[PDB]
């Protein structure tokens, strides 16, 4: 039995174009624990994505937090791509400053 | 109320004998210690500033216990493979959650000891700390075997003694940190949704602890249904974030108000959309 | 301080 990951992509601080911030990709609710996460700027993998250590919640499902430095702008796009055995293909979720 | 929990995971690796073992300790839901067998030099490490108070003896003892848990999980993983008639190779998971909750009277309120296999309930110790609850047939085998060994007494003694003893110590040691709050910084955003309708999103950021309540009101009434509430998420710096939105008729944004409730707020906030 | 699962009491 496999649980499909839930994914939230958001910034640590409210976003202002041109100002340095931190981009988060919080992945939860999945099983098995093996998972592969990439954070992208314009469809290009971002170099230093820090990965928090793995943990699990009271319902046994696993979670983890990937994050990296980024400077939001008007036209650059950001996303988090998650590859997991629960899905037939990698899932890509775009950063939406309104969320 | 207060609590302490140790969440442990052992994962079988195809083509390897020793499983990947990870243990994380929590006090009031905040990570304070961690052990990972994949580290260069497997050792329990402090994860909260107030744990730097513990001497080298503490870490030594804890690290030894981890080495023991690794072997227990290793042998147990092997057993379950037979109980379920699973093919060799493949990867499997075994998890455990143990700990205690203290009430307002700071006295013991309850102990916990639960195991899960493949991310699903396997066997758990009942609140009496004497009987076991097996979730399926395979688990009944383990239950029957443990009823004979008085395995429960062992766990009962840890949950009513050691668990209680250290939770009080950690609470005393990390008091200024664990008991603090960071009240939320909130605001309301306005967004287009569709023909004559817009979304009002009420944000709550940088708060701590995680517990919080956000509500929307139209004409003095609560909007439970019609309100979209995201899942609380970490900012990454120790604080949390959450927002709640509602879709509203364009030209009536002012008729809606957001309320924010949090331990760091002696009085709840009241916000409105502000053009 | 974590719990120690009894050595002779595996699943």
PDB file of C-alpha atoms in Angstrom, chain B residues 10-267:
ATOM      1  CA  UNK B  10      14.397   0.900  10.440  1.00  0.00           C
ATOM      2  CA  UNK B  11      14.412   0.316   6.695  1.00  0.00           C
ATOM      3  CA  UNK B  12      15.559  -2.928   5.029  1.00  0.00           C
ATOM      4  CA  UNK B  13      17.911  -2.389   2.119  1.00  0.00           C
ATOM      5  CA  UNK B  14      17.994  -4.834  -0.790  1.00  0.00           C
ATOM      6  CA  UNK B  15      21.528  -6.181  -0.959  1.00  0.00           C
ATOM      7  CA  UNK B  16      22.494  -5.138   2.552  1.00  0.00           C
ATOM      8  CA  UNK B  17      22.345  -6.820   5.989  1.00  0.00           C
ATOM      9  CA  UNK B  18      22.072  -3.870   8.386  1.00  0.00           C
ATOM     10  CA  UNK B  19      18.939  -1.756   7.936  1.00  0.00           C
ATOM     11  CA  UNK B  20      18.949   2.052   7.861  1.00  0.00           C
ATOM     12  CA  UNK B  21      17.935   3.062  11.422  1.00  0.00           C
ATOM     13  CA  UNK B  22      16.770   6.541  12.413  1.00  0.00           C
ATOM     14  CA  UNK B  23      15.547   7.737  15.810  1.00  0.00           C
ATOM     15  CA  UNK B  24      14.250  11.211  16.621  1.00  0.00           C
ATOM     16  CA  UNK B  25      13.220  12.413  20.035  1.00  0.00           C
ATOM     17  CA  UNK B  26      10.621  15.119  20.647  1.00  0.00           C
ATOM     18  CA  UNK B  27       9.549  17.198  23.629  1.00  0.00           C
ATOM     19  CA  UNK B  28       6.241  19.006  23.144  1.00  0.00           C
ATOM     20  CA  UNK B  29       6.470  18.086  19.444  1.00  0.00           C
ATOM     21  CA  UNK B  30       9.844  19.796  19.007  1.00  0.00           C
ATOM     22  CA  UNK B  31      12.797  17.738  17.763  1.00  0.00           C
ATOM     23  CA  UNK B  32      15.530  17.689  20.411  1.00  0.00           C
ATOM     24  CA  UNK B  33      17.737  14.698  19.632  1.00  0.00           C
ATOM     25  CA  UNK B  34      18.495  12.553  16.625  1.00  0.00           C
ATOM     26  CA  UNK B  35      20.387   9.377  15.651  1.00  0.00           C
ATOM     27  CA  UNK B  36      21.035   8.120  12.074  1.00  0.00           C
ATOM     28  CA  UNK B  37      22.983   4.937  11.288  1.00  0.00           C
ATOM     29  CA  UNK B  38      23.919   6.307   7.863  1.00  0.00           C
ATOM     30  CA  UNK B  39      26.075   9.007   9.444  1.00  0.00           C
ATOM     31  CA  UNK B  40      29.848   8.683   9.240  1.00  0.00           C
ATOM     32  CA  UNK B  41      30.086   8.097  12.971  1.00  0.00           C
ATOM     33  CA  UNK B  42      26.622   6.935  14.191  1.00  0.00           C
ATOM     34  CA  UNK B  43      25.924   8.942  17.330  1.00  0.00           C
ATOM     35  CA  UNK B  44      22.961  10.626  19.051  1.00  0.00           C
ATOM     36  CA  UNK B  45      23.157  14.375  18.362  1.00  0.00           C
ATOM     37  CA  UNK B  46      21.615  17.427  20.053  1.00  0.00           C
ATOM     38  CA  UNK B  47      18.941  19.205  17.999  1.00  0.00           C
ATOM     39  CA  UNK B  48      17.848  21.848  20.532  1.00  0.00           C
ATOM     40  CA  UNK B  49      20.210  24.401  22.121  1.00  0.00           C
ATOM     41  CA  UNK B  50      19.223  23.320  25.614  1.00  0.00           C
ATOM     42  CA  UNK B  51      20.626  19.802  25.095  1.00  0.00           C
ATOM     43  CA  UNK B  52      24.193  21.100  25.011  1.00  0.00           C
ATOM     44  CA  UNK B  53      23.818  20.976  28.805  1.00  0.00           C
ATOM     45  CA  UNK B  54      24.130  17.172  28.807  1.00  0.00           C
ATOM     46  CA  UNK B  55      27.532  15.717  29.518  1.00  0.00           C
ATOM     47  CA  UNK B  56      29.444  13.220  27.314  1.00  0.00           C
ATOM     48  CA  UNK B  57      28.027  10.437  29.486  1.00  0.00           C
ATOM     49  CA  UNK B  58      24.482  11.167  28.320  1.00  0.00           C
ATOM     50  CA  UNK B  59      25.372  10.893  24.673  1.00  0.00           C
ATOM     51  CA  UNK B  60      27.406   7.751  25.261  1.00  0.00           C
ATOM     52  CA  UNK B  61      24.524   5.930  26.960  1.00  0.00           C
ATOM     53  CA  UNK B  62      21.977   7.062  24.345  1.00  0.00           C
ATOM     54  CA  UNK B  63      24.200   6.046  21.470  1.00  0.00           C
ATOM     55  CA  UNK B  64      24.604   2.575  22.976  1.00  0.00           C
ATOM     56  CA  UNK B  65      20.838   2.179  23.247  1.00  0.00           C
ATOM     57  CA  UNK B  66      20.561   3.058  19.585  1.00  0.00           C
ATOM     58  CA  UNK B  67      23.046   0.319  18.675  1.00  0.00           C
ATOM     59  CA  UNK B  68      20.788  -2.044  20.598  1.00  0.00           C
ATOM     60  CA  UNK B  69      17.630  -0.835  18.897  1.00  0.00           C
ATOM     61  CA  UNK B  70      19.285  -1.335  15.510  1.00  0.00           C
ATOM     62  CA  UNK B  71      19.768  -5.035  16.196  1.00  0.00           C
ATOM     63  CA  UNK B  72      16.277  -5.468  17.661  1.00  0.00           C
ATOM     64  CA  UNK B  73      14.749  -3.850  14.566  1.00  0.00           C
ATOM     65  CA  UNK B  74      17.014  -5.937  12.331  1.00  0.00           C
ATOM     66  CA  UNK B  75      15.920  -9.229  13.854  1.00  0.00           C
ATOM     67  CA  UNK B  76      12.283  -8.112  13.943  1.00  0.00           C
ATOM     68  CA  UNK B  77      12.283  -7.052  10.294  1.00  0.00           C
ATOM     69  CA  UNK B  78      13.556 -10.551   9.454  1.00  0.00           C
ATOM     70  CA  UNK B  79      10.746 -12.188  11.441  1.00  0.00           C
ATOM     71  CA  UNK B  80       7.956 -10.177   9.828  1.00  0.00           C
ATOM     72  CA  UNK B  81       9.251 -11.211   6.417  1.00  0.00           C
ATOM     73  CA  UNK B  82       8.358 -14.808   7.333  1.00  0.00           C
ATOM     74  CA  UNK B  83       5.052 -13.965   9.021  1.00  0.00           C
ATOM     75  CA  UNK B  84       3.890 -12.366   5.774  1.00  0.00           C
ATOM     76  CA  UNK B  85       5.639 -14.763   3.422  1.00  0.00           C
ATOM     77  CA  UNK B  86       7.410 -11.928   1.589  1.00  0.00           C
ATOM     78  CA  UNK B  87      10.076 -12.533  -1.054  1.00  0.00           C
ATOM     79  CA  UNK B  88      13.705 -11.844  -0.170  1.00  0.00           C
ATOM     80  CA  UNK B  89      15.242  -8.752  -1.728  1.00  0.00           C
ATOM     81  CA  UNK B  90      12.837  -5.816  -1.606  1.00  0.00           C
ATOM     82  CA  UNK B  91      12.725  -3.047   0.981  1.00  0.00           C
ATOM     83  CA  UNK B  92      10.481  -3.009   4.054  1.00  0.00           C
ATOM     84  CA  UNK B  93       9.843  -0.633   6.929  1.00  0.00           C
ATOM     85  CA  UNK B  94       9.389  -1.015  10.666  1.00  0.00           C
ATOM     86  CA  UNK B  95       8.488   1.991  12.838  1.00  0.00           C
ATOM     87  CA  UNK B  96       7.922   2.579  16.524  1.00  0.00           C
ATOM     88  CA  UNK B  97       6.543   5.501  18.565  1.00  0.00           C
ATOM     89  CA  UNK B  98       7.042   5.482  22.342  1.00  0.00           C
ATOM     90  CA  UNK B  99       6.613   8.123  25.005  1.00  0.00           C
ATOM     91  CA  UNK B 100       4.534   9.793  27.664  1.00  0.00           C
ATOM     92  CA  UNK B 101       2.057  12.666  28.079  1.00  0.00           C
ATOM     93  CA  UNK B 102       1.868  14.779  31.225  1.00  0.00           C
ATOM     94  CA  UNK B 103      -1.355  16.533  32.203  1.00  0.00           C
ATOM     95  CA  UNK B 104      -1.987  20.043  33.568  1.00  0.00           C
ATOM     96  CA  UNK B 105      -1.105  18.602  36.968  1.00  0.00           C
ATOM     97  CA  UNK B 106       2.233  17.757  35.335  1.00  0.00           C
ATOM     98  CA  UNK B 107       1.616  14.209  36.522  1.00  0.00           C
ATOM     99  CA  UNK B 108       1.607  11.156  34.240  1.00  0.00           C
ATOM    100  CA  UNK B 109      -1.449  11.068  32.023  1.00  0.00           C
ATOM    101  CA  UNK B 110      -0.564   8.340  29.558  1.00  0.00           C
ATOM    102  CA  UNK B 111       2.185   6.190  28.026  1.00  0.00           C
ATOM    103  CA  UNK B 112       2.440   5.071  24.364  1.00  0.00           C
ATOM    104  CA  UNK B 113       4.155   2.179  22.602  1.00  0.00           C
ATOM    105  CA  UNK B 114       3.148   1.477  18.979  1.00  0.00           C
ATOM    106  CA  UNK B 115       4.769  -0.416  16.101  1.00  0.00           C
ATOM    107  CA  UNK B 116       3.934  -0.223  12.392  1.00  0.00           C
ATOM    108  CA  UNK B 117       5.064  -2.428   9.523  1.00  0.00           C
ATOM    109  CA  UNK B 118       5.028  -1.114   5.946  1.00  0.00           C
ATOM    110  CA  UNK B 119       3.529   2.119   7.298  1.00  0.00           C
ATOM    111  CA  UNK B 120       0.562   0.295   8.858  1.00  0.00           C
ATOM    112  CA  UNK B 121      -0.483  -0.486  12.455  1.00  0.00           C
ATOM    113  CA  UNK B 122       1.089  -3.737  13.631  1.00  0.00           C
ATOM    114  CA  UNK B 123       0.882  -3.976  17.405  1.00  0.00           C
ATOM    115  CA  UNK B 124       0.247  -1.446  20.169  1.00  0.00           C
ATOM    116  CA  UNK B 125       0.337  -1.377  23.942  1.00  0.00           C
ATOM    117  CA  UNK B 126      -3.060  -0.436  25.428  1.00  0.00           C
ATOM    118  CA  UNK B 127      -3.472   2.500  27.797  1.00  0.00           C
ATOM    119  CA  UNK B 128      -3.331   0.091  30.741  1.00  0.00           C
ATOM    120  CA  UNK B 129       0.221  -0.721  29.737  1.00  0.00           C
ATOM    121  CA  UNK B 130      -0.458  -4.445  30.308  1.00  0.00           C
ATOM    122  CA  UNK B 131      -2.327  -5.708  27.260  1.00  0.00           C
ATOM    123  CA  UNK B 132      -1.508  -5.591  23.540  1.00  0.00           C
ATOM    124  CA  UNK B 133      -3.654  -4.772  20.542  1.00  0.00           C
ATOM    125  CA  UNK B 134      -2.733  -6.655  17.373  1.00  0.00           C
ATOM    126  CA  UNK B 135      -4.021  -5.114  14.123  1.00  0.00           C
ATOM    127  CA  UNK B 136      -3.915  -8.272  12.001  1.00  0.00           C
ATOM    128  CA  UNK B 137      -3.248 -12.039  11.996  1.00  0.00           C
ATOM    129  CA  UNK B 138       0.537 -11.787  11.857  1.00  0.00           C
ATOM    130  CA  UNK B 139       0.479  -9.392  14.808  1.00  0.00           C
ATOM    131  CA  UNK B 140      -1.569 -11.881  16.860  1.00  0.00           C
ATOM    132  CA  UNK B 141       1.487 -14.158  16.686  1.00  0.00           C
ATOM    133  CA  UNK B 142       3.649 -11.444  18.236  1.00  0.00           C
ATOM    134  CA  UNK B 143       0.949 -10.629  20.825  1.00  0.00           C
ATOM    135  CA  UNK B 144       0.646 -14.256  21.937  1.00  0.00           C
ATOM    136  CA  UNK B 145       4.424 -14.531  22.240  1.00  0.00           C
ATOM    137  CA  UNK B 146       4.698 -11.279  24.238  1.00  0.00           C
ATOM    138  CA  UNK B 147       1.845 -12.129  26.618  1.00  0.00           C
ATOM    139  CA  UNK B 148       4.048 -15.001  27.823  1.00  0.00           C
ATOM    140  CA  UNK B 149       7.175 -12.923  28.299  1.00  0.00           C
ATOM    141  CA  UNK B 150       5.756 -10.001  30.232  1.00  0.00           C
ATOM    142  CA  UNK B 151       7.255  -7.751  27.570  1.00  0.00           C
ATOM    143  CA  UNK B 152       4.666  -5.164  28.567  1.00  0.00           C
ATOM    144  CA  UNK B 153       5.996  -4.841  32.117  1.00  0.00           C
ATOM    145  CA  UNK B 154       9.361  -3.740  30.728  1.00  0.00           C
ATOM    146  CA  UNK B 155       7.801  -0.969  28.632  1.00  0.00           C
ATOM    147  CA  UNK B 156       5.397  -0.043  31.427  1.00  0.00           C
ATOM    148  CA  UNK B 157       8.371   0.615  33.745  1.00  0.00           C
ATOM    149  CA  UNK B 158      10.061   2.891  31.172  1.00  0.00           C
ATOM    150  CA  UNK B 159       6.868   4.821  30.435  1.00  0.00           C
ATOM    151  CA  UNK B 160       5.981   5.481  34.070  1.00  0.00           C
ATOM    152  CA  UNK B 161       9.538   6.009  35.303  1.00  0.00           C
ATOM    153  CA  UNK B 162      12.382   6.982  32.984  1.00  0.00           C
ATOM    154  CA  UNK B 163      10.128   8.716  30.426  1.00  0.00           C
ATOM    155  CA  UNK B 164       8.558  10.774  33.208  1.00  0.00           C
ATOM    156  CA  UNK B 165      11.910  11.520  34.839  1.00  0.00           C
ATOM    157  CA  UNK B 166      13.584  12.861  31.714  1.00  0.00           C
ATOM    158  CA  UNK B 167      10.603  14.769  30.412  1.00  0.00           C
ATOM    159  CA  UNK B 168      10.635  16.752  33.665  1.00  0.00           C
ATOM    160  CA  UNK B 169      14.367  17.300  33.312  1.00  0.00           C
ATOM    161  CA  UNK B 170      14.171  18.470  29.710  1.00  0.00           C
ATOM    162  CA  UNK B 171      11.226  20.741  30.596  1.00  0.00           C
ATOM    163  CA  UNK B 172      13.322  22.211  33.380  1.00  0.00           C
ATOM    164  CA  UNK B 173      16.389  22.524  31.152  1.00  0.00           C
ATOM    165  CA  UNK B 174      14.728  23.881  27.991  1.00  0.00           C
ATOM    166  CA  UNK B 175      12.031  25.855  29.828  1.00  0.00           C
ATOM    167  CA  UNK B 176      12.845  29.321  28.435  1.00  0.00           C
ATOM    168  CA  UNK B 177      12.718  27.836  24.949  1.00  0.00           C
ATOM    169  CA  UNK B 178       9.904  25.270  25.047  1.00  0.00           C
ATOM    170  CA  UNK B 179       7.505  27.518  26.972  1.00  0.00           C
ATOM    171  CA  UNK B 180       8.029  30.624  24.743  1.00  0.00           C
ATOM    172  CA  UNK B 181       5.667  31.755  22.005  1.00  0.00           C
ATOM    173  CA  UNK B 182       6.089  33.741  18.822  1.00  0.00           C
ATOM    174  CA  UNK B 183       2.716  35.226  18.086  1.00  0.00           C
ATOM    175  CA  UNK B 184       1.651  35.353  14.441  1.00  0.00           C
ATOM    176  CA  UNK B 185       2.240  38.178  12.000  1.00  0.00           C
ATOM    177  CA  UNK B 186      -0.924  38.307   9.926  1.00  0.00           C
ATOM    178  CA  UNK B 187      -2.355  40.073   6.899  1.00  0.00           C
ATOM    179  CA  UNK B 188      -5.021  39.660   4.207  1.00  0.00           C
ATOM    180  CA  UNK B 189      -4.387  39.390   0.490  1.00  0.00           C
ATOM    181  CA  UNK B 190      -6.871  39.871  -2.340  1.00  0.00           C
ATOM    182  CA  UNK B 191      -6.962  37.796  -5.502  1.00  0.00           C
ATOM    183  CA  UNK B 192      -9.019  37.396  -8.677  1.00  0.00           C
ATOM    184  CA  UNK B 193     -10.890  34.044  -8.798  1.00  0.00           C
ATOM    185  CA  UNK B 194     -13.518  34.241 -11.544  1.00  0.00           C
ATOM    186  CA  UNK B 195     -16.382  36.248 -13.067  1.00  0.00           C
ATOM    187  CA  UNK B 196     -17.449  38.666 -10.325  1.00  0.00           C
ATOM    188  CA  UNK B 197     -15.732  36.680  -7.598  1.00  0.00           C
ATOM    189  CA  UNK B 198     -12.473  37.131  -5.717  1.00  0.00           C
ATOM    190  CA  UNK B 199     -10.490  35.331  -3.095  1.00  0.00           C
ATOM    191  CA  UNK B 200      -9.552  36.736   0.279  1.00  0.00           C
ATOM    192  CA  UNK B 201      -6.645  34.922   1.899  1.00  0.00           C
ATOM    193  CA  UNK B 202      -5.850  35.451   5.581  1.00  0.00           C
ATOM    194  CA  UNK B 203      -2.184  34.725   6.368  1.00  0.00           C
ATOM    195  CA  UNK B 204      -0.581  33.903   9.691  1.00  0.00           C
ATOM    196  CA  UNK B 205       3.216  33.722   9.666  1.00  0.00           C
ATOM    197  CA  UNK B 206       6.229  33.099  11.866  1.00  0.00           C
ATOM    198  CA  UNK B 207       4.265  31.765  14.797  1.00  0.00           C
ATOM    199  CA  UNK B 208       5.180  29.218  17.478  1.00  0.00           C
ATOM    200  CA  UNK B 209       4.071  26.741  18.671  1.00  0.00           C
ATOM    201  CA  UNK B 210       2.260  25.279  15.620  1.00  0.00           C
ATOM    202  CA  UNK B 211      -1.226  25.232  17.134  1.00  0.00           C
ATOM    203  CA  UNK B 212      -3.464  27.924  15.766  1.00  0.00           C
ATOM    204  CA  UNK B 213      -6.985  28.759  14.640  1.00  0.00           C
ATOM    205  CA  UNK B 214      -8.055  30.964  11.726  1.00  0.00           C
ATOM    206  CA  UNK B 215     -11.666  31.774  10.905  1.00  0.00           C
ATOM    207  CA  UNK B 216     -13.675  33.866   8.462  1.00  0.00           C
ATOM    208  CA  UNK B 217     -16.917  35.647   9.248  1.00  0.00           C
ATOM    209  CA  UNK B 218     -19.769  37.046   7.175  1.00  0.00           C
ATOM    210  CA  UNK B 219     -22.385  39.003   9.127  1.00  0.00           C
ATOM    211  CA  UNK B 220     -21.182  37.670  12.464  1.00  0.00           C
ATOM    212  CA  UNK B 221     -21.341  34.031  11.399  1.00  0.00           C
ATOM    213  CA  UNK B 222     -18.541  31.448  11.041  1.00  0.00           C
ATOM    214  CA  UNK B 223     -17.609  30.164   7.576  1.00  0.00           C
ATOM    215  CA  UNK B 224     -16.421  26.581   8.232  1.00  0.00           C
ATOM    216  CA  UNK B 225     -17.704  25.282   4.905  1.00  0.00           C
ATOM    217  CA  UNK B 226     -16.707  27.639   2.072  1.00  0.00           C
ATOM    218  CA  UNK B 227     -13.368  28.203   3.763  1.00  0.00           C
ATOM    219  CA  UNK B 228     -10.175  26.679   2.393  1.00  0.00           C
ATOM    220  CA  UNK B 229      -7.553  26.051   5.079  1.00  0.00           C
ATOM    221  CA  UNK B 230      -4.028  24.969   4.091  1.00  0.00           C
ATOM    222  CA  UNK B 231      -2.101  22.516   6.175  1.00  0.00           C
ATOM    223  CA  UNK B 232       0.203  24.151   8.751  1.00  0.00           C
ATOM    224  CA  UNK B 233       3.716  24.236   7.326  1.00  0.00           C
ATOM    225  CA  UNK B 234       7.228  25.010   8.660  1.00  0.00           C
ATOM    226  CA  UNK B 235       8.864  28.297   7.693  1.00  0.00           C
ATOM    227  CA  UNK B 236      12.175  26.479   8.160  1.00  0.00           C
ATOM    228  CA  UNK B 237      13.409  28.659  10.997  1.00  0.00           C
ATOM    229  CA  UNK B 238      11.508  27.018  13.808  1.00  0.00           C
ATOM    230  CA  UNK B 239       8.293  28.964  13.228  1.00  0.00           C
ATOM    231  CA  UNK B 240       5.163  28.019  11.278  1.00  0.00           C
ATOM    232  CA  UNK B 241       2.772  29.393   8.633  1.00  0.00           C
ATOM    233  CA  UNK B 242      -0.895  28.898   7.751  1.00  0.00           C
ATOM    234  CA  UNK B 243      -3.585  30.683   5.760  1.00  0.00           C
ATOM    235  CA  UNK B 244      -7.303  30.412   5.221  1.00  0.00           C
ATOM    236  CA  UNK B 245      -9.181  31.760   2.228  1.00  0.00           C
ATOM    237  CA  UNK B 246     -12.785  32.231   1.117  1.00  0.00           C
ATOM    238  CA  UNK B 247     -14.244  33.172  -2.267  1.00  0.00           C
ATOM    239  CA  UNK B 248     -16.340  36.326  -2.171  1.00  0.00           C
ATOM    240  CA  UNK B 249     -18.520  38.442  -4.464  1.00  0.00           C
ATOM    241  CA  UNK B 250     -16.548  41.312  -5.971  1.00  0.00           C
ATOM    242  CA  UNK B 251     -17.736  44.451  -4.212  1.00  0.00           C
ATOM    243  CA  UNK B 252     -18.350  42.845  -0.842  1.00  0.00           C
ATOM    244  CA  UNK B 253     -14.838  42.162   0.382  1.00  0.00           C
ATOM    245  CA  UNK B 254     -15.436  44.571   3.271  1.00  0.00           C
ATOM    246  CA  UNK B 255     -18.234  42.456   4.697  1.00  0.00           C
ATOM    247  CA  UNK B 256     -15.742  39.735   5.647  1.00  0.00           C
ATOM    248  CA  UNK B 257     -13.402  39.532   8.625  1.00  0.00           C
ATOM    249  CA  UNK B 258     -10.639  37.098   9.606  1.00  0.00           C
ATOM    250  CA  UNK B 259      -9.893  36.154  13.203  1.00  0.00           C
ATOM    251  CA  UNK B 260      -6.599  34.679  14.372  1.00  0.00           C
ATOM    252  CA  UNK B 261      -6.287  32.722  17.643  1.00  0.00           C
ATOM    253  CA  UNK B 262      -2.932  31.749  19.130  1.00  0.00           C
ATOM    254  CA  UNK B 263      -1.333  31.107  22.543  1.00  0.00           C
ATOM    255  CA  UNK B 264       0.892  34.149  22.025  1.00  0.00           C
ATOM    256  CA  UNK B 265      -2.171  36.310  21.537  1.00  0.00           C
ATOM    257  CA  UNK B 266      -3.942  37.306  24.748  1.00  0.00           C
ATOM    258  CA  UNK B 267      -6.687  38.669  22.492  1.00  0.00           C
TER     259      UNK B 267
END
